[PDB]
């Protein structure tokens, strides 16, 4: 199952498939999964309960499978459909300004969110 949480509403608690972008590449979790801690990166995320799929745009967070076969995900903010065109355009402009000006880390993340959105 999936336990997904945000500090404004806990989105999930049994979810069938979860697709996660992790610092181990991309991970798919189904029911029992061996217990890990994985950092969730800034992401395009899918959570599927059955074949029905919900697509999430994520500010990264943490994933930690607890040894009871539950994927505890905590993240700052999630939707993808809400996030997805003019905002991508704005992000391009903002990316240009950000390129010159921690300023590096900001620009890397700014490019990453813009790219991840561009993927949508």
């Amino acid at each position: 199952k999936l336990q997904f949480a945000l500090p404004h509403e806990t989105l999930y608690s049994e979810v069938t498939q979860v697709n996660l972008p992790a610092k181990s590449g991309r991970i798919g979790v189904l029911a029992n999964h061996v217990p890990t801690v994985e950092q969730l990166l800034p992401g395009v995320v899918e959570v599927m309960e059955g074949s029905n799929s919900k697509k999430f745009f994520i500010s990264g967070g943490f994933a930690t499978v607890q040894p009871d076969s539950q994927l505890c995900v905590t993240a700052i903010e999630a939707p993808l459909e809400s996030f997805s065109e003019n905002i991508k355009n704005l992000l391009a402009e903002a990316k240009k300004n950000v390129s010159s000006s921690r300023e590096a880390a900001e620009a890397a993340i700014q490019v990453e969110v813009l790219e991840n959105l561009q993927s949508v």
Binding site: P7, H8, T10, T36, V37, E38, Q39, F62, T64, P67
Partner: protein
């Protein structure tokens, strides 16, 4: 004289009563939102705590505290100060990072080896992850937080919608995670530095929880205080009312004496 001094003070007391009534009611409205945030946040936190337990994390010492800049939110300022004081016998020279102006004054007094970093302007605002994140970033750099093998956080756990019990919890440093043994039933290679990442993330995630717990307790205290105020004001209203009534009767006796003097004529 009696009459006017009674009345003017009674009017003051009335005006105070009215303001505190208004505040108490508005506080109740506000309290619902404060508490609401705290539920969702606390649920999010518990998922992480599930890790810390199973990891058997088993944590100088840092003290962090949470209060508001704002006042008239009961005895939060001094009750949290008191629960700090008990644990400030556990290291007097401990550096307290104070989120909120009010507790700061009291702690600063209790030891001046305390306030090193402080954060002003959280008190007005609601619990928000961004704030927690910036505070975390500054905590790591300024206080060298990871260096301290202990961190302890203070807040007011909002026990019931009419109570607050001051509470603390331990934030687990990157060193702690490393040497906790049942961290090994969870997995990472070396591809990420999960102690160095998880510490930072739970520095904020735990901090946000502490803030949420505190914020609800603050608004709860304000409600409680303003209610008790209405009672105290009522008592003074009644005492001065009896005095007013007696003073009124006496004047009529003087007037009747004047009329009786006219009768003597």
């Amino acid at each position: 004289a009696t009459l006017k001094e009674v009345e003017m003070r009674l009017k003051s007391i009335k005006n105070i009563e009215k303001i505190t009534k208004t505040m108490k009611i508005v506080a109740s409205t506000r309290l619902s939102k404060a508490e609401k945030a705290k539920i969702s946040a606390k649920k999010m936190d518990e998922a992480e705590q599930l890790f810390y337990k199973n990891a058997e994390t088993k944590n100088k010492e840092l003290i962090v505290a949470i209060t508001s800049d704002k006042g008239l939110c009961g005895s939060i300022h001094s009750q949290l100060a008191k629960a700090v004081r008990r644990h400030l016998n556990d290291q007097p020279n401990a550096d307290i990072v104070t989120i909120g102006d009010k507790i700061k004054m009291q702690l600063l007094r209790t030891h001046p080896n305390n306030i090193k970093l402080s954060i002003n302007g959280i008190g007005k605002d609601a619990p928000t992850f961004q704030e927690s994140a910036l505070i975390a970033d500054k905590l790591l750099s300024v206080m060298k937080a990871g260096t301290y093998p202990k961190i302890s956080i203070f807040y007011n756990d909002p026990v019931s919608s009419l109570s607050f019990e001051p509470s603390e919890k331990p934030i687990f440093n990157a060193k702690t995670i490393e040497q906790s043994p049942s961290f090994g039933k969870f997995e990472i290679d070396t591809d990420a530095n999960v102690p160095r990442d998880l510490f930072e993330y739970t520095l904020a995630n735990q901090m946000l929880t502490a803030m949420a717990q505190g914020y609800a307790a603050e608004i709860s205290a304000r409600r409680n205080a303003m209610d008790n105020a209405s009672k105290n004001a009522g008592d003074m209203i009644n005492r001065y009312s009896i005095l007013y009534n007696r003073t009124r009767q006496a004047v009529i006796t003087n007037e009747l004496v004047d009329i009786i003097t006219g009768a003597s004529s």
